[PDB]
Amino acid sequence: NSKLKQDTIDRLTTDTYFTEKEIRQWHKGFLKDCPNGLLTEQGFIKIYKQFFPDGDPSKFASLVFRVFDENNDGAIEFEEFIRALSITSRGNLDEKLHWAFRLYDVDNDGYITREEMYNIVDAIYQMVGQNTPQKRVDKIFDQMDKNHDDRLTLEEFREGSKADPRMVQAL
Amino acid sequence: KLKQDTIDRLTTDTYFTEKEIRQWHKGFLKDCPNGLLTEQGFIKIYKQFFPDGDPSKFASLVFRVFDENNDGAIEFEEFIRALSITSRGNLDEKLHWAFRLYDVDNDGYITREEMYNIVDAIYQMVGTPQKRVDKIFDQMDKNHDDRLTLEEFREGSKADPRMVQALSL
Ligand SMILES: [Ca+2]
Ligand SMILES: [Ca+2]
Ligand SMILES: [Ca+2]
Ligand SMILES: [Ca+2]
Ligand SMILES: [Ca+2]
Ligand SMILES: [Ca+2]
């Protein structure tokens, strides 16, 4: 059933930054675009092509699709689409870096490895054209990997990702 | 002067860690022996970020929102609470802070002159100008009374990010 149910709205308004009025209007758009209520991977990548016309965004969009597809059934339902957008577009910085941690930790083992990291950084370079991804990976691990075990925990990744505020740096 | 008393209120109310708070305190004291950051000291900070311009006007407006107690100085606790919001807050929290920045007389409404003043201050730091503002202002201005409530400013900003972003600096 493709109808937005009230029980979906109640969990969404409880967990997300959106109001019911926003959810119901977003839902009419989502339905227009996705008549059976399911956003597919091809459809998702197509959105990334719109945002990034002059690279190949497909690798990165596939990685993001999998994080949006929380129940791993190969589709993004509406509730999934909204939960993800709430965090990324209205979340505080910790909520966003936690979502981003899930993006990198592709096997969900609780760590970002050097390989998982190279893979994201390579996907982003493919999405926008212009020294190597390998050098960026070494640099991130140099600052962020405090116990030198070639992996990043959520705390290391989140705290490393969090810059000192510009004003603090200035002092 | 780091009352552990203070660190607790700070970790409880901000997105900062004890570690972070204790470290940055050291930087604060080095800069302001007093424990008190003055307005012209604050301006110097922005001048590091924006060397081409004159940042005095923007920094002054910002300075007043940091200085929650209206006593003319930014104490460490004021400094970290303002920073927690602008550097780590959610969209609503940032939007509320931007509203205090735009609302220069703190009357709970933003006027069109108030918006001109902040945009002009940005142009001075960073660099027709009214009309642009006049149009955004006019879109946000839902019941058309020529003043923006917070609600009007928030929702207006979920469509018109440019005013808040500008605050970003
Ligand atoms: Ca799914
Ligand atoms: Ca992993
Ligand atoms: Ca590690
Ligand atoms: Ca004060
Ligand atoms: Ca006002
Ligand atoms: Ca109005």
From Swiss-Prot, chain B:
GO biological process entries: chemical synaptic transmission; neuromuscular junction development; neurotransmitter secretion; regulation of neurotransmitter secretion; regulation of signal transduction; vesicle-mediated transport
Tissues with expression: In the embryo, highly expressed in the ventral ganglia.
One Pfam family of this chain: EF-hand_1
Entry-linked PROSITE patterns: EF_HAND_1, EF_HAND_2
Binding positions for Ca(2+) 1 per the UniProt entry: 67, 69, 71, 73, 78
Protein residues bound to Ca(2+) 2: 103, 105, 107, 109, 114
The keyword Repeat is annotated on this UniProt entry: yes
Keyword 4Fe-4S applies: no
Changes seen on gene knockout: Increased number of type Is boutons in neuromuscular junctions of abdominal segment 3 muscle fibers and reduced nerve-evoked excitatory junction potential.
CDD domains (UniProt xref): EFh
InterPro entries linked to this entry: EF-hand-dom_pair, EF_Hand_1_Ca_BS, EF_hand_dom, Recoverin
Domain EF-hand per the UniProt entry, residue ranges: 23-48, 54-89, 90-125, 128-163
Family: Belongs to the recoverin family.
Subunit structure: Interacts with ric8a in a Ca(2+)-independent manner.
Misc remark: Binds 3 calcium ions via the second, third and fourth EF-hands. Phenothiazine FD44 binds to frq2 and disrupts interaction of frq2 with ric8a. This leads to reduction of synapse number to normal levels and restoration of normal learning performance in a Drosophila model of fragile X syndrome, suggesting that the interaction interface may be a suitable target for the treatment of fragile X and other synaptopathies.
Entry protein name: Frequenin-2
Organism: Drosophila melanogaster (Fruit fly)
